[PDB]
Design a protein around this ligand. Sequence first.
Ligand code: MG
Ligand code: MG
Ligand code: MG
Ligand code: MG
Ligand code: MG
Ligand code: MG
Ligand code: MG
Ligand code: MG
Ligand code: MG
Ligand code: MG
Ligand code: MG
Ligand code: MG
Ligand code: MG
Ligand code: MG
Ligand code: MG
Ligand code: MG
Ligand code: MG
Ligand code: MG
Ligand code: MG
Ligand code: MG
Ligand code: MG
Ligand code: MG
Ligand code: MG
Ligand code: MG
Ligand code: MG
Ligand code: MG
Ligand code: MG
Ligand code: MG
Ligand code: MG
Ligand code: MG
Ligand code: MG
Ligand code: MG
Ligand code: MG
Ligand code: MG
Ligand code: MG
Ligand code: MG
Ligand code: MG
Ligand code: MG
Ligand code: MG
Ligand code: MG
Ligand code: MG
Ligand code: MG
Ligand code: MG
Ligand code: MG
Ligand code: MG
Ligand code: MG
Ligand code: MG
Ligand code: MG
Ligand code: MG
Ligand code: MG
Ligand code: MG
Ligand code: MG
Ligand code: MG
Ligand code: MG
Ligand code: MG
Ligand code: MG
Ligand code: MG
Ligand code: MG
Ligand code: MG
Lengths: 170, 136, 98, 48, 96
Amino acid sequence: MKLNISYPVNGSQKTFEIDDEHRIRVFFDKRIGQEVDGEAVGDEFKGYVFKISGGNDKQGFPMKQGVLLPTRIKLLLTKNVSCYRPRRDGERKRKSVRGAIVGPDLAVLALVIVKKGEQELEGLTDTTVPKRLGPKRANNIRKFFGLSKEDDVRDFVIRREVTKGEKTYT
Amino acid sequence: SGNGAQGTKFRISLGLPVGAIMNCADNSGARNLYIIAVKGSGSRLNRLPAASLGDMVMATVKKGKPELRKKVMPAIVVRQAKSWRRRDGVFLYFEDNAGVIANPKGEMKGSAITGPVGKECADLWPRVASNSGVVV
Amino acid sequence: MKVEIDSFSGAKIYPGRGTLFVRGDSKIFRFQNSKSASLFKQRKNPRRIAWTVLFRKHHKKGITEEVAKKRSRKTVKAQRPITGASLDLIKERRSLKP
Amino acid sequence: AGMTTIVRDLDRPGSKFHKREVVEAVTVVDTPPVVVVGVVGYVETPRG
Amino acid sequence: ANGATSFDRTKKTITPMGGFVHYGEIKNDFIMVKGCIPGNRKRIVTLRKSLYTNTSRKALEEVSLKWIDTASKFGKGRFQTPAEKHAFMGTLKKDL
RNA sequence: GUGAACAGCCUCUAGUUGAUAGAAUAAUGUAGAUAAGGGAAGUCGGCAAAAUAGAUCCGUAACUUCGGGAUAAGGAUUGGC
RNA sequence: GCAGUCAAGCGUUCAUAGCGACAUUGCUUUUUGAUUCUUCGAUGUCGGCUCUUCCUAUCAUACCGAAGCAGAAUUCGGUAA
RNA sequence: GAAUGUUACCGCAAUAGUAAUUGAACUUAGUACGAGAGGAACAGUUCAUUCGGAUAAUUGGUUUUUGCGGCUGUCUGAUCAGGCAUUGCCGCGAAGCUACCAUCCGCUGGAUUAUGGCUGAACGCCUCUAAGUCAGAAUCCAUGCUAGAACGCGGUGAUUUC
RNA sequence: UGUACAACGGGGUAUUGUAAGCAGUAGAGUAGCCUUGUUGUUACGAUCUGCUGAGAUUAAGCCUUUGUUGUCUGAUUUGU
RNA sequence: GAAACUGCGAAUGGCUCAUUAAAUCAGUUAUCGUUUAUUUGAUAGUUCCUUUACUACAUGGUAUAACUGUGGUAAUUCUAGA
Ligand SMILES: [Mg+2]
Ligand SMILES: [Mg+2]
Ligand SMILES: [Mg+2]
Ligand SMILES: [Mg+2]
Ligand SMILES: [Mg+2]
Ligand SMILES: [Mg+2]
Ligand SMILES: [Mg+2]
Ligand SMILES: [Mg+2]
Ligand SMILES: [Mg+2]
Ligand SMILES: [Mg+2]
Ligand SMILES: [Mg+2]
Ligand SMILES: [Mg+2]
Ligand SMILES: [Mg+2]
Ligand SMILES: [Mg+2]
Ligand SMILES: [Mg+2]
Ligand SMILES: [Mg+2]
Ligand SMILES: [Mg+2]
Ligand SMILES: [Mg+2]
Ligand SMILES: [Mg+2]
Ligand SMILES: [Mg+2]
Ligand SMILES: [Mg+2]
Ligand SMILES: [Mg+2]
Ligand SMILES: [Mg+2]
Ligand SMILES: [Mg+2]
Ligand SMILES: [Mg+2]
Ligand SMILES: [Mg+2]
Ligand SMILES: [Mg+2]
Ligand SMILES: [Mg+2]
Ligand SMILES: [Mg+2]
Ligand SMILES: [Mg+2]
Ligand SMILES: [Mg+2]
Ligand SMILES: [Mg+2]
Ligand SMILES: [Mg+2]
Ligand SMILES: [Mg+2]
Ligand SMILES: [Mg+2]
Ligand SMILES: [Mg+2]
Ligand SMILES: [Mg+2]
Ligand SMILES: [Mg+2]
Ligand SMILES: [Mg+2]
Ligand SMILES: [Mg+2]
Ligand SMILES: [Mg+2]
Ligand SMILES: [Mg+2]
Ligand SMILES: [Mg+2]
Ligand SMILES: [Mg+2]
Ligand SMILES: [Mg+2]
Ligand SMILES: [Mg+2]
Ligand SMILES: [Mg+2]
Ligand SMILES: [Mg+2]
Ligand SMILES: [Mg+2]
Ligand SMILES: [Mg+2]
Ligand SMILES: [Mg+2]
Ligand SMILES: [Mg+2]
Ligand SMILES: [Mg+2]
Ligand SMILES: [Mg+2]
Ligand SMILES: [Mg+2]
Ligand SMILES: [Mg+2]
Ligand SMILES: [Mg+2]
Ligand SMILES: [Mg+2]
Ligand SMILES: [Mg+2]
């Protein structure tokens, strides 16, 4: 099954395909939220700890947290709820949902690094991707740089350069 | 299991001998089905031909649309209430005995099926497979 | 090979074991043995049957250390200021004064 | 000694259970090593 | 790990929980033959080479076990190993 | 005592404890029972067996000599404190 | 009841693929008659149920020969119980 | 089960019995054949019917396990714990027994018939037949399987002192 | 006279479904005492809860035992 | 000025005449028996704390879409993880 791992420190994320069910078997009967020692998944992840965050089984149905039962159910999903974006004010639909207990029918296990191991992963620790946006509210700037509200936020806002053919802008 | 049966069927505990009555689970107008015979059954002094999930039977309709009554027609068994054992080791059983009325080819007289259906029957008759919702 | 659980008690149904029952509404019930099944046919309620899982969970039995503390935290403390924002000019200004 | 149950895949191309798990009964016969304590040799006669 | 396999890996012999009923606690090499055999438990049995080669496609199949049952036969057995038992049960008025 | 009761079931008083005995528990019996799914296909024939059942309340057809039919049929309820 | 021999005919043509009159020769003894030998100091005298074995004049199944056998279907015949 | 010295083990096989059965689907193939309409089979594969011999992992039935629990009536002052009611009634119930209601297993050589042929005279030709001969069936004989002659037999171990 | 056999006890296995005892601010409530209540008190009350997946039963054709106790030469017959 | 958030509208309109016989409906009443987005007209010096070593008012808090990236499903105005 495919493994959708993420290193939230660098914003990195690479996918892995693990065959050899003995290695997959570690995640079986584990819920979303429990931590996994990677040494059992493989050797490249030795000392790496993984957070189980979700995933989609075959037929692409997502997992929903805390909905135990390594099977599918059909919940009545509402506003502010996982695996559902409404279409009308006060709209609910009954949709299928895959449980939060890992099973062999999962196409992809979504994983989150919690502790680094002893070997840099290929495109996960070796590379880092910067955050997209910057602080736009006044006080959030004062707390991204620790500004002590006398330091004139107007100069501490972030500027993003951009090229227009032969005119570099800001 | 006779004409137009697509594939074979691993043996499954017989549960409906001649004279049993099963719910008719299609929308044809019939309510029940009185079994009078089983296609493909054999012979032994004093045995009653019984039918298992997936067998085609000859039946009459005791309760239903008057046009459906007083006449013998094929029908396909879609639910047994007598446990049987699949090759994956499970003994399973439905809550009724149920079937749908068909023509000798295997096509169905009614447009849908109001029940679960045994896969041993869905695998065997495509027309039942179409009209079925939840299977097993 | 999946080990199933009893839909009345909570017992592990290893392969072959127990019996399976397709109810009229196509809801499926598995039992590990004819005990749970007869209770189930009797319309008994697992939360009132002292040895079932659904009973013991409800009456909070034997779950003592499953509600204790743990140690599952992390530590990152990284920086990657803003995409396209000349991050090589965003560290010579992130030198907090107070 | 007795019997038990076995679960195994089924390699039988064409069977509706091909490459699928089946559960099966087996007997077990306790077979500690036998010990050789003699040899006898037989000849052919018009009587057997 | 007589009763373990390439897929099971739980270290355990073929002896079921609390012993083969009416026989004992198999502790020597053994033969596991598919299905059933003439005779009853504790009886002397002869296993003999086939008198003919079978092509048959049913023989010549090279089986490989996934999981061998080792739950108790003296009742409606629910656990393969005693470890599994304490795992699912919890702790009782005796143990500790 | 239970209960409508001289019913059945248990008790007090009184009277019995009389009926060859011992060891086994094969077949076939005699007498008592239970059986998955089907439900009379068995049979001359539902023979045998099973199902039903008390009470309070609701409800009750044709037909009739108006008296009946009628516990028609069909339902609900029933402990303890 | 079953099977023959002759072959006038039937079979568009063509006696005999398949049939076959007028005649004629047989076999069989689950038809019915004819008879009255055995039993009238008694051989339990319909049918079914159950169970076993036997016969072949073979309905099916194995292998064959033939056709008015293109195929498919069928029909005649052989070894066959 | 007496007696062929005693007793024990391991064996041989005379004779007798004997068993497997039928179907369908896939594929061959919309093929051969046919103007068309229609429309096969050998090989291979998956299942099935009828029969048989076992077997009890599993599921199911059975319950005096009177094993646990529950219930009515009564009797032991109450409690505890029990007796009686032709096994009082009810739920669950292991063990055993048991079911196409459950699972497993059911061998392969030869010789022949019908028939089709080889070579080939009688009969300078011709002929499967006269001599000689090939192929050949749910047949038959074996193989296999069950019994083992209690007056059929082999090999082998030990063989008594008051 | 010993991987001996037995009778018990122990451990496993298994069946039932939570023993007796005690306790409780659980309990529709009910009575009795007065100092007639700013939880007033002594108790009683189907039932519920805790100690408690407890207790009971488990080879009579279940398994296993470093424990305890015991047993271990009666009779008859046979030779080429 | 895409996307998206937010706000509002989607309860109007249009269609049909199935049900409906003291119901609907019509004329005539009642709200001293109630809710009312909106439009219009009015309407707000009081908010703190045992009330000097004092409360951000020169204005307090995160947590999200879009987006970036990694993904699942034969399949949809499906959506998951980061
Ligand atoms: Mg798919
Ligand atoms: Mg028939
Ligand atoms: Mg009959
Ligand atoms: Mg359709
Ligand atoms: Mg049972
Ligand atoms: Mg007297
Ligand atoms: Mg007498
Ligand atoms: Mg007597
Ligand atoms: Mg006696
Ligand atoms: Mg008897
Ligand atoms: Mg019963
Ligand atoms: Mg029955
Ligand atoms: Mg009925
Ligand atoms: Mg009837
Ligand atoms: Mg009849
Ligand atoms: Mg009559
Ligand atoms: Mg009747
Ligand atoms: Mg009667
Ligand atoms: Mg009954
Ligand atoms: Mg009447
Ligand atoms: Mg009441
Ligand atoms: Mg003539
Ligand atoms: Mg001609
Ligand atoms: Mg002519
Ligand atoms: Mg006749
Ligand atoms: Mg006479
Ligand atoms: Mg006489
Ligand atoms: Mg006589
Ligand atoms: Mg007489
Ligand atoms: Mg003949
Ligand atoms: Mg011609
Ligand atoms: Mg011939
Ligand atoms: Mg015969
Ligand atoms: Mg014969
Ligand atoms: Mg002598
Ligand atoms: Mg085709
Ligand atoms: Mg033509
Ligand atoms: Mg047969
Ligand atoms: Mg049998
Ligand atoms: Mg049993
Ligand atoms: Mg009792
Ligand atoms: Mg009482
Ligand atoms: Mg008490
Ligand atoms: Mg008495
Ligand atoms: Mg009496
Ligand atoms: Mg059989
Ligand atoms: Mg052989
Ligand atoms: Mg021979
Ligand atoms: Mg010849
Ligand atoms: Mg000759
Ligand atoms: Mg000649
Ligand atoms: Mg044969
Ligand atoms: Mg054989
Ligand atoms: Mg002898
Ligand atoms: Mg001898
Ligand atoms: Mg408890
Ligand atoms: Mg001890
Ligand atoms: Mg409108
Ligand atoms: Mg928040």
